[PDB]
Design a protein around this ligand. Structure first.
Ligand SMILES: [Ca+2]
Lengths: 56, 223
């Protein structure tokens, strides 16, 4: 699978509280984390199904 | 807010919570129909909650009002966060009382060393996640621009100001963005960004509101 799928979730420097989905490579599943609102990385999705379709 | 204290119920009447299903940012009421927040808190649909203390329990003093217009600063930069300010016009004027009040815009730019009050419902831990039910408060000073620049080499613009402590331990965090930094009764800053939360040598960075008073007033008058 893509490299960005193996990277841990990136909250970023912004201080908003936005729930986003990411692919948890080890556990091999899609979960949620707190995104700050800016400078998002690729392992950041607005929906679970969108995460699985890309990192599945 | 990391390392702060629970605010006295309704002691920060100008604080608002931005909600689109859940609390995601703070804001400040500046007049009966307008709220100021951070541009990175932009959402196509936003509900503003005023008169809040415990964000997860209906207390009876709250007012729920939808945003009618959302206006980000035209020069907002999503990468550098320069000009991280946004205005929200409410669908209808709110009722001003002891629990819901406005905060004054700055008369001038406050000098470094000025003690201020920061508030919000953001994360309270530097490591891990702990979202508070009750509004949190933090007394912190405006830092000298030189120390701000030294903490964030080449990342600080004239539209930003650092507030907090270089030793870390106390700071704003995720969930606090858009929130107020009030010094001597005037809104001097808007919670914007920072590297981590409450980490040494990385104090929070805030939008310097005194540089936008004219933009705010002109925008409100034209909308
Ligand atoms: Ca409540």
């Amino acid at each position: 699978r893509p490299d960005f799928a193996l990277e841990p979730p990136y909250t970023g420097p912004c201080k908003a509280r936005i729930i986003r989905y990411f692919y948890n490579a080890p556990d091999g599943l899609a979960q949620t984390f707190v995104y700050g609102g800016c400078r998002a990385k690729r392992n950041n999705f607005k929906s679970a199904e969108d995460a699985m379709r890309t990192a599945g | 807010i990391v390392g702060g204290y629970t605010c006295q119920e309704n002691s920060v009447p100008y604080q608002v919570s931005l909600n689109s299903g859940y609390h995601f940012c703070g804001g400040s009421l500046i007049n009966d129909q307008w709220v100021v927040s951070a541009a990175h808190c932009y959402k196509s649909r936003i509900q503003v909650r005023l008169g809040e203390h415990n964000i997860n329990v209906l207390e009876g003093n709250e007012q729920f009002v939808n945003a009618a217009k959302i206006i980000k600063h035209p020069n907002f930069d999503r990468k550098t966060l320069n000009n991280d300010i946004m205005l929200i016009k409410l669908s209808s004027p709110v009722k001003l009382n002891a629990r819901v009040a406005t905060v004054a815009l700055p008369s001038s730019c406050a000098p470094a060393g000025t003690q201020c009050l920061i508030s919000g419902w953001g994360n309270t831990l530097s490591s891990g996640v702990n979202e508070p039910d009750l509004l949190q408060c933090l007394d912190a000073p405006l830092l000298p621009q030189a120390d701000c620049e030294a903490s964030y080499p080449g990342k600080i613009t004239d539209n930003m100001v650092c507030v907090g402590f270089l030793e870390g331990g106390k700071d704003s965090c995720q969930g606090d963005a858009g929130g107020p930094v009030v010094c001597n009764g005037e809104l001097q800053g808007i919670v914007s960004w920072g590297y981590g939360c409450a980490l040494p040598d990385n104090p929070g960075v805030y939008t310097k509101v005194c540089n936008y008073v004219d933009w705010i007033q002109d925008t409100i008058a034209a909308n």
